[PDB]
Amino acid sequence: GYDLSVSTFSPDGRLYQVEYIYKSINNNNTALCLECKDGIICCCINSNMDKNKMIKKNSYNRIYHVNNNIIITYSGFDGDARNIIDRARSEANTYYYNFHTNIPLHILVNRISLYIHAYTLYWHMRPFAASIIISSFNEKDKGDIYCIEPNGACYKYSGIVIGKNKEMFKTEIEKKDYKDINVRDAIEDIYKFILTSDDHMNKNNLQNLVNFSWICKESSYEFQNIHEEILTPALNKAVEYI
Amino acid sequence: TTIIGIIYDNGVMLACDSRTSTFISNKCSRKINRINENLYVCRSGASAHSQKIIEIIKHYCVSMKNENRKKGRFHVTKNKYFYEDKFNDYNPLVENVAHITKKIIYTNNNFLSCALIFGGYDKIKKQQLYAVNLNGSIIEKHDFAVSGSGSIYIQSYLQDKYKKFMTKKECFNLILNCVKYAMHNDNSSGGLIRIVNITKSFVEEFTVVNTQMNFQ
Amino acid sequence: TTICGLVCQNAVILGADTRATEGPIVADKNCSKLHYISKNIWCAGAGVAGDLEHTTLWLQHNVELHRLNTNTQPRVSMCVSRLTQELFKYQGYKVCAIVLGGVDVNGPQLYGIHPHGSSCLLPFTALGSGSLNAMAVLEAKYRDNMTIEEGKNLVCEAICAGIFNDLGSGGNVDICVITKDSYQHIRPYKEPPTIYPKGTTPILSEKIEYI
Amino acid sequence: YDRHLTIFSPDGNLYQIEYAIKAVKNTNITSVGVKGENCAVIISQKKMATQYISQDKLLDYNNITNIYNITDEIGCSMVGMPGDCLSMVYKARSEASEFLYSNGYNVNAETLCRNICDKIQVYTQHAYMRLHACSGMIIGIDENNKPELFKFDPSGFCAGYRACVIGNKEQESISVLERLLEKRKTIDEDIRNTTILAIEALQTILAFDLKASEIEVAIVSTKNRNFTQISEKEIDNYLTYIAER
Amino acid sequence: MARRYDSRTTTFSPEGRLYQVEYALEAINNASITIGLITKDGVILGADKVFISKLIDKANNYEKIYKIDKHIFCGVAGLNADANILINQSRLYAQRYLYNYNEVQPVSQLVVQICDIKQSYTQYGGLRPYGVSFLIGGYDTKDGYQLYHTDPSGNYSGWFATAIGTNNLTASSVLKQEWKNDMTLEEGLLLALKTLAKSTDTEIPKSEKIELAYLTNKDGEVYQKYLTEKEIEELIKLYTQK
Amino acid sequence: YSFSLTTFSPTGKLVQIEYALNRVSSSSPALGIRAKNGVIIATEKKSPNELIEENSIFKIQQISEHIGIVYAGMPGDFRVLLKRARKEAIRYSLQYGSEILVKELVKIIASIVQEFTQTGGVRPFGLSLLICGVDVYGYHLYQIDPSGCYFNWMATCVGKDYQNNMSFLEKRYNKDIEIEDAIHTAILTLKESYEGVLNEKNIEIGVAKPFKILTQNEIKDYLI
Amino acid sequence: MDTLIGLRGNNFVVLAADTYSINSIIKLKNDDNTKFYDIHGNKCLLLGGSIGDRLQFGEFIRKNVHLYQYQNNTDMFVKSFAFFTRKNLAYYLRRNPFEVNCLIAGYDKKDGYQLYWCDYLSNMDSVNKGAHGYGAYLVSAILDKYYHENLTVDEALDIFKLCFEELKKRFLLTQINYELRIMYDNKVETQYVTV
Amino acid sequence: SIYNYNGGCVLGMSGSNCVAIACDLRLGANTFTTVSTKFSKIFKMNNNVYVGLSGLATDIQTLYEILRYRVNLYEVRQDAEMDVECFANMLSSILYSNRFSPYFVNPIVVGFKLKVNYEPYLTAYDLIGAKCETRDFVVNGVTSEQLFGMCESLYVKDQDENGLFETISQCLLSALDRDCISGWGAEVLVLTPEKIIKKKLKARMD
Amino acid sequence: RNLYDTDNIIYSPEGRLYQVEYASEAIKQGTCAVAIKSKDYVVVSGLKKCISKLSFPQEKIFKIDDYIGISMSGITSDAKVLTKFMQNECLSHKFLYNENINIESLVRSVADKYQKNTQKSSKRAFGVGLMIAAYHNEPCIFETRPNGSYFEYDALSFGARSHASKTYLEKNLHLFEECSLEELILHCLKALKCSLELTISNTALAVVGKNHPWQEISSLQLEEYLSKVK
Incomplete structure (x- = not known):
């Protein structure tokens, strides 16, 4: 009876609706961000759409950006995450209007965390069902990656995975330190981890179900999606390895 | 009123008179206001308007400074203060405070008649002068800024004497002589001269008693 | 009106005359112009009669509310901030030229507040029509460190100068000595007919009603 | 549905307040506040609150922190659900800034705690909003140069303390603090002794050796009114001073 | 969902009844008795006090009978806090009518206004009704002396003599047996004492649990008296003489 | 979305108000006594556990210069109503220039307490207030319930075992006694129901000169 | 321009007004009917000023008093009617004023026959006699001279005849046609007087 | 010039154990046409509180209605008569609540403060509630200068009821004889703690 | 699941929003619609619902803008609301600026409108699915859903x-890119016919593409195409 409203604590001091949101997110499509020596690399594996064959090639992209220098991705429902990303862009716009400089990453993360958290307080609002990764990289400060949970918790990482099969992806990513590995070498490792972890993914759908993006030295520390010419030899080498 | 800012090699010096209002209502005033430990601003124009602008922008700067804090662990009478924020971790940028002040002035520029000179130091752009004009336009000055009634009388004089990389001593002498000449020529400016020198690691505020001597 | 304030060692001394005028006509010969704001804060008003009285009552009771909530001794700077924000809320109107004098943990503080909402911390000041007459005496005779009795004498001289030189000033001298521990409001500090026969007035009717 | 909402049960209890306090207890984070003669110290365990997500190895452990600045001079520790705790930090900052703007001088710790508890009471009374599961300690220096240490819970009950704990153990940690303070009965000596007592109290309460990397210590004093975190090296030196007899 | 916690106070029952109104009436019927009657001299209100303890200040405290205006007074049966709310509102309405018209409100118009307020809570919104029933007595030039009886529904009626609260039926029986048209002030006061004694199950009425007040017009001026324990004791001994 | 959470039961009762009264009856006891030259309000607490600042947990509080208040119930509710009552007294003083009469304050706060028993989406206040004061019409001691009902008392108690304390006061109280006698009676009534020995630390007393809150040494001098 | 006249005795009240409807320089009508507003229950509101403001205010007051009397099932007292009219006129004074001058007449059992004079600024008082318009300047003294407390209604009508003749003879607007309300003996009568 | 439309003046004076208020009875129109000679500007609030309202007649009536409303609510709520000083502060607050759209009125308040001791109480106002209390006399209206002169010359401290009546009546009548737009009768109320004497003076009608 | 399907803001223990799922379930009862494209054109076809002998067929496809049309499946009133919103957005973009609205921006705005009704307890998801056909620098087919998601196909x-239509499209997808317009229309009509005969009354059919504003195909041309399909 206590699990029918986000605004009610259960006798053991838990909000069951947020836990059910966590269960919803853990079944959704995988997303990961990884700090590297020269950049951050973001990768979204949309394994759920392996059934739908008529979807346009690479149309579905869960990787978005703010200010052309902050990557923002998610695992969860598309509409809620679009709402959060619109809030992030609004916060960046308001900050630049007030102060004439771009929003710091930690301030944006805190504000979006509060925005997510506010919907877990009242009996009439649906809490957002999405975990949100927000990340950036700079020449001086290196990489900063944050993950905002559906409960409003925000935590900083060197690398993070959310969504389906995140345990296996985390286990494979943890095998080696990536802060002394470049992003171009890291793409092959990400493809190998996807082939070993997600059972729906295979050689014939890696090219059209996976979104890639990064912020590194080669992109002048600004947002970009990986071109096909860089992706194709990497996934070919991963398939040959596997 | 005379308010002056000059960037020198290792800091920025602001200076002002003390006279307020044919009748002198006050002769010991504070036209230079401490917004933050690394950021001061000089006022000119209507007094109540500028003072409420100072209070609003102090509130904004305090909010910005509290929000700028990251989580975790990292790493002739003078009065001197060392910055608590040694590494400039969370002190707001001078550009940010000057630009929100410009926004507030421009939004209310129908009735607000205030010209401000922000001076300060941050780790990104080092020492900066910003001039916020009457209608709410902001211009960054890399050599000097001047405003108020008296400043006009010294314009060419400052333009004659400014050097690109002045030391502390000669910049102090220049700014003091500039305010002295402006007070000599302008009735609306007078009294003791307040100077604020802002540097990488400290701020020192000088008070000066003055007299103009000439046999021209 | 002539009002004045000065800062002596561990004390503020406010002073005022006791004349209120309806234009050329003296409307009140013993008006009180020193207003209580708290035990350690007093003020005097030199502007629109109503605005000063109601603003002083508002400030006094809001300061009492703040004292009750926070339990701290009130600060003069809080009164300055509240007054200036309220006066700037109106575009120059609700004119109140105030001398606000108090003692708090930061020391004795004297402020001149203008009707447009600008404040100025001062060692002494004077306000009203006879402000310049008082300021002459104060600027002649003020020194930084003075005893309470010397400050009282100088305040009395300034207010008397305003009384005798400004036509809008007259009556007695009021003073208030504010310290941290208490205040001493000395209202009468200094002071520089026919009976008709019964029934002479004709009447048309009279009615007697018993209470 | 009397236990679902913040309305009275037949026994007169608001069980939602009890369950919010249970949620605060479930995080398994211990924080301890101590008051010196002219200083105050907060120590916290620098661990992620026990929640759905566990601790990842790639998680930046320096970023974890239950201690926050409200102003330059007032600080706090906040234990509970992390989103609730962040929301309460932002609320406290907004209250302090509003006090500074309206009154022209900085709020003190007590008035800040009372304003925060006024906000919390609305959650306790209005059925349409959830209680913030967040317990908090606040420290500052008042105008009289004496240290203030105050503590509040989700019920909205503010109290001043010479020393206090937010954690899983109460009436044993209270005994530990009682023993240390009665044993205790120059500004630098006061600062050092109070920091030592906070560190040793946390070590005794938690019942295992503390690593300097996994605890955060912050202090206010008349020597430095700004609420500042001491370095990891200083905490390591203080831990070394323990067990050297 | 908050509609699960909504009791729907303003919703009809199957029998065309408001259950909350009927429960408020039940609350009224359990409260102590208040009687009203009309004499030739004027209006009488009486009530039996609820004895909580001997430490109550019985000097100038009246908890059942209240003044609304110099020409209107009322007796309460039900919850006292709701009654205080509605009494303050009635005082506001009387002075609002004096403001708008420069003459005193007729008693019927005040009864209509306060009963409209009571009816609004039964028809509009989702709040509980006021759990009070009034006996509003008064005088006006157009209609003379008047006594109205209100209810939680906003229904009101007009009476020459009636009773509300506990044991109101037996009080009404005694009233119809004993009340008559042309009756004096003393006779009406003795009848009020008799009715309070009969309804309170006491052979002799005790002055310490009787509130008694009356409104009378003399010299074209309305005057209200609230009898003290001394005057009530005088009337008690007069009642026992008869 | 606003509806009353307090509703009439089938027997006409408002169960939420009954439960607020139950919470009142379990909370720590407070009392008031009106004497012919004054009025006092007293309360007790558990002994402090050597850490909590006693001065920061006073239940007796000053409303205005000659008005004080104590409560039995929920502390946060008490702080909210205390702030509101200070605001209302200040509003009266702004309007009429004089200190608020005790009856007017009691009526206003009683109406405010009533409003939370009918307005939607809220619960009743979980406390009972005792307000003591002096004005031109004399000395007043008023109780206010969670319902919003208020009572004019000569002496009363509003918490744990308040029937027993009320019987004690009924035997002891007289209409004409001094302030010292009333304080002695209040202390004896408090220590009667208390489990164990009632020290000075387990007592707060306020007395209405302006409204005074007694110091610990004064209470100890009374306890001799 | 709209001349209004009122005269109150112990046993009557009489109101009178010119019957001209003016539009710039032309008389739209010599039998105007937008000045008198008879209310149910022995009450009359005689309005001057702008025709549109007269219509709006007169119908507003009439529809409000009728609503009162039907809601309460009683006749509103004349004093209450007059002070309600003044209150509503003063309410609009600082927000879109009704530039209308008012004579308010009635009969009560409580207070007998009653006349109230009220101007466009809502300055009201009870009077035995009163007038409005520029023509007031030419009639008021006549009302002062020939009035006495025990006038019969016919003597009052003779006084009004003197007022009308003076308005014809001396006033710039040679006002010839007049309407009269006579309240007396629990009846309200209408009369029309030319010259 | 708004005060010249109707004219009018109110006066109050104090004696020993007695106080008096007085006013003219004219209602004028356009500064020169007299339209009533019974327009009393004195209003009873309670037995120890009277108010004299001079200025624009519509604002006199509106303010009197507001004050009657407030006083009746206060007295019925508290079951006691309102203190004269409480009423004076309330009148100040009411006048200041309309600061930017004021009622064009210049009130005086005359009454007895109760302490039973009956102390005279007199205070005069401006249109926005700035009040000055006096021990001797109070004046408002367009005839303020003449009233000030008469009261300054003729006021005698601690007069009995008869002497107070004669002095206040002579002050009012002499002041009114020098004012075009005020007069046409004069009302004089004399309050003592047991009774009130209301008189109408045989005044000029010019 | 009866506990958790009562209000739209409740997640089930499996992390499902049952009311949004029911709004999606409303879409399958609508008549079939099909949309395909080539390099140059998008062809939309649909079966018009006919509820009785004397009825006229319910309209299935609607014009949004000169190069934008839609078809709907589900509750037609919700579709009307979304249609008016889309038409107003297109005309507002043509009013403020002098250019056609970006199709992706329009579809995102529609999806935001979908999602905003899923957040509050006082609202319900739009119980309708839209397929949006347009030519904005290339042929494009979008789909919207009650949960605020959208996709491109x-x-x-x-x-x-x-x-059955989906199976036919799965078989024949590789041909459509190089098909001419006549072959594309034939393929779309055959895919629709797999769902069932078709008739000029009961068959909505429209084309949009390069140098070709949105146009319903006339009844005579539709008769020719239906004859060719049979």
Whole structure:
């Protein structure tokens, strides 16, 4: 009876609706961000759409950006995450209007965390069902990656995975330190981890179900999606390895 | 009123008179206001308007400074203060405070008649002068800024004497002589001269008693 | 009106005359112009009669509310901030030229507040029509460190100068000595007919009603 | 549905307040506040609150922190659900800034705690909003140069303390603090002794050796009114001073 | 969902009844008795006090009978806090009518206004009704002396003599047996004492649990008296003489 | 979305108000006594556990210069109503220039307490207030319930075992006694129901000169 | 321009007004009917000023008093009617004023026959006699001279005849046609007087 | 010039154990046409509180209605008569609540403060509630200068009821004889703690 | 699941929003619609619902803008609301600026409108699915759903008995890119016919593409195409 409203604590001091949101997110499509020596690399594996064959090639992209220098991705429902990303862009716009400089990453993360958290307080609002990764990289400060949970918790990482099969992806990513590995070498490792972890993914759908993006030295520390010419030899080498 | 800012090699010096209002209502005033430990601003124009602008922008700067804090662990009478924020971790940028002040002035520029000179130091752009004009336009000055009634009388004089990389001593002498000449020529400016020198690691505020001597 | 304030060692001394005028006509010969704001804060008003009285009552009771909530001794700077924000809320109107004098943990503080909402911390000041007459005496005779009795004498001289030189000033001298521990409001500090026969007035009717 | 909402049960209890306090207890984070003669110290365990997500190895452990600045001079520790705790930090900052703007001088710790508890009471009374599961300690220096240490819970009950704990153990940690303070009965000596007592109290309460990397210590004093975190090296030196007899 | 916690106070029952109104009436019927009657001299209100303890200040405290205006007074049966709310509102309405018209409100118009307020809570919104029933007595030039009886529904009626609260039926029986048209002030006061004694199950009425007040017009001026324990004791001994 | 959470039961009762009264009856006891030259309000607490600042947990509080208040119930509710009552007294003083009469304050706060028993989406206040004061019409001691009902008392108690304390006061109280006698009676009534020995630390007393809150040494001098 | 006249005795009240409807320089009508507003229950509101403001205010007051009397099932007292009219006129004074001058007449059992004079600024008082318009300047003294407390209604009508003749003879607007309300003996009568 | 439309003046004076208020009875129109000679500007609030309202007649009536409303609510709520000083502060607050759209009125308040001791109480106002209390006399209206002169010359401290009546009546009548737009009768109320004497003076009608 | 399907803001223990799922379930009862494209054109076809002998067929496809049209499946009133919103957005973009609205921006705005009704307890999800056909620098087919998601397709179909149409599209997708317009219309009509005969009355059919504003195909041309299909 206590699990029918986000605004009610259960006798053991838990909000069951947020836990059910966590269960919803853990079944959704995988997303990961990884700090590297020269950049951050973001990768979204949309394994759920392996059934739908008529979807346009690479149309579905869960990787978005703010200010052309902050990557923002998610695992969860598309509409809620679009709402959060619109809030992030609004916060960046308001900050630049007030102060004439771009929003710091930690301030944006805190504000979006509060925005997510506010919907877990009242009996009439649906809490957002999405975990949100927000990340950036700079020449001086290196990489900063944050993950905002559906409960409003925000935590900083060197690398993070959310969504389906995140345990296996985390286990494979943890095998080696990536802060002394470049992003171009890291793409092959990400493809190998996807082939070993997600059972729906295979050689014939890696090219059209996976979104890639990064912020590194080669992109002048600004947002970009990986071109096909860089992706194709990497996934070919991963398939040959596997 | 005379308010002056000059960037020198290792800091920025602001200076002002003390006279307020044919009748002198006050002769010991504070036209230079401490917004933050690394950021001061000089006022000119209507007094109540500028003072409420100072209070609003102090509130904004305090909010910005509290929000700028990251989580975790990292790493002739003078009065001197060392910055608590040694590494400039969370002190707001001078550009940010000057630009929100410009926004507030421009939004209310129908009735607000205030010209401000922000001076300060941050780790990104080092020492900066910003001039916020009457209608709410902001211009960054890399050599000097001047405003108020008296400043006009010294314009060419400052333009004659400014050097690109002045030391502390000669910049102090220049700014003091500039305010002295402006007070000599302008009735609306007078009294003791307040100077604020802002540097990488400290701020020192000088008070000066003055007299103009000439046999021209 | 002539009002004045000065800062002596561990004390503020406010002073005022006791004349209120309806234009050329003296409307009140013993008006009180020193207003209580708290035990350690007093003020005097030199502007629109109503605005000063109601603003002083508002400030006094809001300061009492703040004292009750926070339990701290009130600060003069809080009164300055509240007054200036309220006066700037109106575009120059609700004119109140105030001398606000108090003692708090930061020391004795004297402020001149203008009707447009600008404040100025001062060692002494004077306000009203006879402000310049008082300021002459104060600027002649003020020194930084003075005893309470010397400050009282100088305040009395300034207010008397305003009384005798400004036509809008007259009556007695009021003073208030504010310290941290208490205040001493000395209202009468200094002071520089026919009976008709019964029934002479004709009447048309009279009615007697018993209470 | 009397236990679902913040309305009275037949026994007169608001069980939602009890369950919010249970949620605060479930995080398994211990924080301890101590008051010196002219200083105050907060120590916290620098661990992620026990929640759905566990601790990842790639998680930046320096970023974890239950201690926050409200102003330059007032600080706090906040234990509970992390989103609730962040929301309460932002609320406290907004209250302090509003006090500074309206009154022209900085709020003190007590008035800040009372304003925060006024906000919390609305959650306790209005059925349409959830209680913030967040317990908090606040420290500052008042105008009289004496240290203030105050503590509040989700019920909205503010109290001043010479020393206090937010954690899983109460009436044993209270005994530990009682023993240390009665044993205790120059500004630098006061600062050092109070920091030592906070560190040793946390070590005794938690019942295992503390690593300097996994605890955060912050202090206010008349020597430095700004609420500042001491370095990891200083905490390591203080831990070394323990067990050297 | 908050509609699960909504009791729907303003919703009809199957029998065309408001259950909350009927429960408020039940609350009224359990409260102590208040009687009203009309004499030739004027209006009488009486009530039996609820004895909580001997430490109550019985000097100038009246908890059942209240003044609304110099020409209107009322007796309460039900919850006292709701009654205080509605009494303050009635005082506001009387002075609002004096403001708008420069003459005193007729008693019927005040009864209509306060009963409209009571009816609004039964028809509009989702709040509980006021759990009070009034006996509003008064005088006006157009209609003379008047006594109205209100209810939680906003229904009101007009009476020459009636009773509300506990044991109101037996009080009404005694009233119809004993009340008559042309009756004096003393006779009406003795009848009020008799009715309070009969309804309170006491052979002799005790002055310490009787509130008694009356409104009378003399010299074209309305005057209200609230009898003290001394005057009530005088009337008690007069009642026992008869 | 606003509806009353307090509703009439089938027997006409408002169960939420009954439960607020139950919470009142379990909370720590407070009392008031009106004497012919004054009025006092007293309360007790558990002994402090050597850490909590006693001065920061006073239940007796000053409303205005000659008005004080104590409560039995929920502390946060008490702080909210205390702030509101200070605001209302200040509003009266702004309007009429004089200190608020005790009856007017009691009526206003009683109406405010009533409003939370009918307005939607809220619960009743979980406390009972005792307000003591002096004005031109004399000395007043008023109780206010969670319902919003208020009572004019000569002496009363509003918490744990308040029937027993009320019987004690009924035997002891007289209409004409001094302030010292009333304080002695209040202390004896408090220590009667208390489990164990009632020290000075387990007592707060306020007395209405302006409204005074007694110091610990004064209470100890009374306890001799 | 709209001349209004009122005269109150112990046993009557009489109101009178010119019957001209003016539009710039032309008389739209010599039998105007937008000045008198008879209310149910022995009450009359005689309005001057702008025709549109007269219509709006007169119908507003009439529809409000009728609503009162039907809601309460009683006749509103004349004093209450007059002070309600003044209150509503003063309410609009600082927000879109009704530039209308008012004579308010009635009969009560409580207070007998009653006349109230009220101007466009809502300055009201009870009077035995009163007038409005520029023509007031030419009639008021006549009302002062020939009035006495025990006038019969016919003597009052003779006084009004003197007022009308003076308005014809001396006033710039040679006002010839007049309407009269006579309240007396629990009846309200209408009369029309030319010259 | 708004005060010249109707004219009018109110006066109050104090004696020993007695106080008096007085006013003219004219209602004028356009500064020169007299339209009533019974327009009393004195209003009873309670037995120890009277108010004299001079200025624009519509604002006199509106303010009197507001004050009657407030006083009746206060007295019925508290079951006691309102203190004269409480009423004076309330009148100040009411006048200041309309600061930017004021009622064009210049009130005086005359009454007895109760302490039973009956102390005279007199205070005069401006249109926005700035009040000055006096021990001797109070004046408002367009005839303020003449009233000030008469009261300054003729006021005698601690007069009995008869002497107070004669002095206040002579002050009012002499002041009114020098004012075009005020007069046409004069009302004089004399309050003592047991009774009130209301008189109408045989005044000029010019 | 009866506990958790009562209000739209409640997640089930499996992390499902049952009311949004029911709004999606409303879409399968609508008549079938199909949309395909080539390099140059998008062809939309649909089965018009006919509820009785004397009825006229319910309209299935609607014009949004000169190069934008839609088809709907589900509750037609919700579709009307979304249609008016889309038309107003298109005309507002043509009013403020002098250019056609970006199709992706329009579809995102529609999806935001979908999602905003899923957040509050006082609102319900739009119980309708839209397929949006347009030519904005290339042929494009979008789909919107009650949960605020949207997708882009090379070929799309939904409604009652749309599984057979989906199977036909799965078989024949590789041909559509190089098909001419006549072959594309024939393929779309055959995919629709797999869902079932077709008739000029009961068959909505429209084309949009390069140098070709949105146009319903006339009854005579539709008769020719239906004859060719049979």
